[PDB]
Amino acid sequence: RPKLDAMRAQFMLMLDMLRETAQESADSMDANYRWFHPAPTTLAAAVG
Amino acid sequence: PQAAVVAIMAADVQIAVVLDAHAPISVMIDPLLKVVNTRLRELGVAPLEAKGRGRWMLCLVDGTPLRPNLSLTEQEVYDGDRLWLKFLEDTEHRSEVIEHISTAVATNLSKRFAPIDPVVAVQVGATMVAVGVLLGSALLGWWRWQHESWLPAPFAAVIAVLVLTVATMILARSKTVPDRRVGDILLLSGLVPLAVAIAATAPGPVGAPHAVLGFGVFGVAAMLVMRFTGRRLGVYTALVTLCAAATAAGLARMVLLTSAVTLLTCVLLACVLMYHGAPALSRWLSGIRLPVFPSATSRWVFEARPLEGPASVRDVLLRAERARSFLTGLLVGLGVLTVVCLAGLCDPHAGRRWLPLLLAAFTFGFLILRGRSYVDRWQAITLAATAVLIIAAVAVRYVLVSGSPAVLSAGVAVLVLLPAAGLTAAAVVPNTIYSPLFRKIVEWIEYLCLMPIFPLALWLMN
Amino acid sequence: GYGLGLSTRTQVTGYQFLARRTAMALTRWRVRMEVEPGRRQVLAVVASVSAAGVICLGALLWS
Incomplete structure (x- = not known):
């Protein structure tokens, strides 16, 4: 049991590192898309 | 049609404008922005700018945005109101997801609540050592009340001097932070063992001389800490109020041999007089040029x-x-004094018992005057609280030692019905609206409660 | 997987692991789990209980 539980924990932390990498990628995609595609309400900037 | 004159504020300038009272906000917001930008540019002030994606919006000064699809009328914008003009930053973004339950729990809690921190930890330690030293001082007072030993007074003196020197060193060395309230807590905590140490030096059986000496020295120290520190002064104001009354009672029991009832009625009279005088006295005490450590609201204005x-x-x-x-400290101290004197007067097993219940009712109304009159939330709440506590204290003072179902049923019934009436006056009554005439008549009635106290004060004195 | 269906011992330990990891995520706000004092102190509890049991048996042998 203890060795297996250590292996589990280790794998899970690796998966967390991947998840945060996905998070930062998704944040970049979000910022890009909303820059190209503002919400209709926000279009009242109308300049620049 | 109707128009609302309102002073809008935008980019550290307030401008009075006359607005169409029932055009929707969506109609007027744009040319209002153009007018404000024109006025700012005319003033040489940098105009408003749309910081990225977002929208221009108007808020009440409390912060809530107005309904753009709605007019000023149906959202209760009246004449003489004020509005705050803003460009609200865009809210929308990707709604993130953490699929694993454990990591989602951990990140949500960590994001949304506040951990323990050493800043908090030092305050907790100060609070717990304050509680400990008040227990120790009250315990030594209990022992000197029970036993005639001279030896408790050195212990009280030594613990007082240790905690007071520690508080002074913390206040001197670590004055640089608003966590100097650790020192303030220690000083508040350590003035009490000093008071019981001085009080326990009075020889013979414990009583009025010990009481007058301890309360006098504690009130004197509480008066000095005003001029030397000037910090956390409401609690010291309440304490010096209580010590002033207790010292007046102790001198009345030493210089004279007056009865307790005479003194309690004197104390009640002093209370209702001081309630009348308290705001003026507070405006006097407002300007004593004591040191200038700012409080929380003043700090958080000064930072902006x-x-x-x-x-x-x-x-x-x-x-x-x-x-x-x-003012708040004074009212709390008077509230304590008022309930303690009314509790002391209403012994159930006395022949005059009907009279102080009238004194209670008159004071109850008089306090409710001030409660409706005084502006600060926590002062109105103070006045209401003490008024209720009058009733509760006298009720229990009867029903505990008067072993009868009659008084029990009477007390418990009024004890549940009376605050429900007190609630009812605002819960059902629409926004507590009454006519000004009816209000002034209620003010007359609770004023007409006051001048019966004067002869009753004479009659209970003799 | 509703109901009282069967489960393997590897799932029993897998659930107990996720329970401990969630407990650590609840009391602390970290899930790095390379060491875990929760287990260590419940083992200390187990030591307390087993010692009380042992002494209770050692008490039984007297007559």
């Missing part, structure tokens, strides 16, 4: 800003907050 100019507004603000704190 840099008889004329800044020093005038700063003096005005500090003066007003010192007034508010003194």
